[PDB]
Structure formats: C-alpha cells, structure tokens
Amino acid sequence: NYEVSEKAFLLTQSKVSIEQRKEAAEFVLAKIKEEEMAPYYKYLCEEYLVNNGQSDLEHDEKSDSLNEWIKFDQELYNELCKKNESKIKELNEKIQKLEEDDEGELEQAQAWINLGEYYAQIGDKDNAEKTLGKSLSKAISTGAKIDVMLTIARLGFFYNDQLYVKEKLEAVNSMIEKGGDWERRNRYKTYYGIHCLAVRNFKEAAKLLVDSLATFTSIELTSYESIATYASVTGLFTLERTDLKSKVIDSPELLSLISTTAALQSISSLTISLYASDYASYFPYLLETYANVLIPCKYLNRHADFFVREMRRKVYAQLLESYKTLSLKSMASAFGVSVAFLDNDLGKFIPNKQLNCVIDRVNGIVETNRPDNKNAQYHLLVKQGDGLLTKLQKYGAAVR
C-alpha cells in the first residue's frame, strides 16, 4: 500500500530526470500485474493526465508520454476479473455459511475483515468502509478496535485519503479507550503527525511525530525508512536547536539506519554542518538533499519552499547572534556564494521579520538589533492585551 503509493508519488512528482519516472512506472507495472489494482491505476493515470505519463489504452491514447508502463491492457481484465470473481464468490459463501451455522460473533467480523482486505487490495473507497463498519457493529471485545485501526490506515496510505481515516481513528479510539497496545499507540501518533502537517500547523505535527518511534515498521502501513526520514526532517524543521542537539543529532536507531542506506542525510551531515555554522557547505548540501530525498517522499514535498527558506534563514539567524558586526560583503563574496544571491535572498527574509538584521545591501554591512528598551515583551504584551479588550467590548455590544 505504502510501497504502491510511494512509487506512485515518485512518477507523478517527476521532473528531475528520466529515470525518476521510469523506475517508478516499472515498479508500479510489477505491482499492478502482481494483484488486481485497476481503479487505483485508473486514478494514477487521470492524476498525471496532460503531463508526460498520458499513455493508456482505455480512456486516452497519447504517445507524447515518456512512460509506457502506465498503459492499460485488456489482459488486465482477465486477471482482475478471475481473481475478483474467486474472492467475491468464496467470501459470500463464507458469510452465508457462517451465518447459516449461526457461528461466531466475531467470525462474522473476520469474514468482513477478509472482505475489507480484498477491497483495499483492489483499491475501493466505499466498498471497504461499508464492509468494515459491520465488524465494529458486531464488537464484543477490544479485538474490534485493533482490526478497525489497521484497515482504515491501509486505505489511507494507498489513496492519500485524510479525512475518514482521521474521523474513524478518533471515533474508534473513544469507542473503547485504554490506549490499546503499544504498537497501536505509535500508529495513532504517526497518523496524527500526517494530519497536522497536512492542515499545516508544523509544530503540532512534530509534537506527535517525533515522539512516534523512529524504527516503527509494519511494511505497508509504514516502513522503517519512511517513519524515520519523516520524523528526522520535521524534527530539524520546526524545532529549536536545543531539541536538535538533544535528539536530532542522533537517535541510536538512525545510526544503524544510515549504515545500510544513504537515503537520510539529515541526522548526520546537515546537522553537523548547521552546528559548525556554514553556508559554503550547508546550503550546497541542502540542495542535494532536497532533490534526492525530499521531492521523492510524499510528506517532504508538502513543506517545500518553507523547508528550504526557514533553514537557510535559521543558520543565518544564529550567525547574526554571534556577530554583532557582520560583513555582508565578506560573506556574500567568499563564504561559498556570490554577492547577489546572499544580498537578495537576505533582503527577502527581513520583512518576514524572523530576524533582527540591520541591513545595508550595497555597503555590505549588517549589524544587529538588541531588544533592550523595547523588550520583545513590552511591545508584544502592549498589543496582545488588546486581544483581551476587544472580546469584552464584543460582549458589551450585545448585552441583555
């Protein structure tokens, strides 16, 4: 589900190279011919239509495509159909035969989790939901929460559905609440981390996601690579540096991870650069990580130019605080960049106001503004208390 979706994401988010799409489409070809998955193939094709993966043999015929493993065949409709006929037939006989015996009050539920597996493997939206609610209706043990939680999470990761996986997780957790198993706690948090980066709040996501295990795997409900890379990056991104030297300089799982695969570059290399303070090494390295790791991932292309801009801003921001008198001419010249880049994107940062950078661009000097007899607090409090005052005026608008 994960491995389907991830490489599906990889095709659709292709613009970098030929092989980025090509490898995606082949793995998707392998998978779509492995098991019946026609309507989620259909979606993929539709979603990257009028692009450069528009080749098909059932709803659009174009040869301008750079892919040809996003094509239908009608050979699909002999495999899909015999598998679906066997499965529906076998399971109708199961539910029928069980009910007829008057056997179980969970075996009816097991028969419908089976149908739910069956439907989430084809990629169905409504068929899977409507079967699964049956098992939760014939609840009599905490077993029902565990099964419900696994199947909603499977559909979610395949489609990229947010909303009924989110409602259904929340709805089921209060259905009976004791926090369940350990394993279920990690899943519950991690999905929540998705949700808060998806509405876009940033920090809220980190609170659940980083505290989620960074070695959690269940193959297709998330892999080891996925959870860990996602934790580590959001980690860096929305957190202060006290957190970073504590936790995002190493988890001992990450050490072991990066040993086997070079798909991280964010617990080791970028952290160490940032702590030493660079722009010669740090911004090059950001770009390389960005292309290779970030755009490929489903949830690191979802904070895009914010990742890039806040993190170049953060290294600049900490260098500002150590150097009261900073030569923008020396830095921009010789610190592994050119004058015009450093000056114009610095000038971009400044009225977003995440800096106390007292700038002259052409003289090539920057100085540094203390809070002193402005505070941060005196002025900030000075207009926060007017938040309070408006709501009482609002109350005294309406009165009795």
Binding site: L287, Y290, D305, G336, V337, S338
Partner: peptide
C-alpha cells in the same frame, strides 16, 4: 523556489572555482 536557487547555486560554485 527550487529551480532558481539551483541555477544560482551552480553558477556560484563555477565562479568560486574560477578565482
């Protein structure tokens, strides 16, 4: 935006390399 930065980046490096 990624595209802009990459173009500038490649440029900076090339320039630095030719000093």
């Amino acid at each position: 935006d990624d595209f802009t930065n990459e173009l500038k980046a490649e440029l900076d490096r090339y320039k630095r390399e030719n000093q």
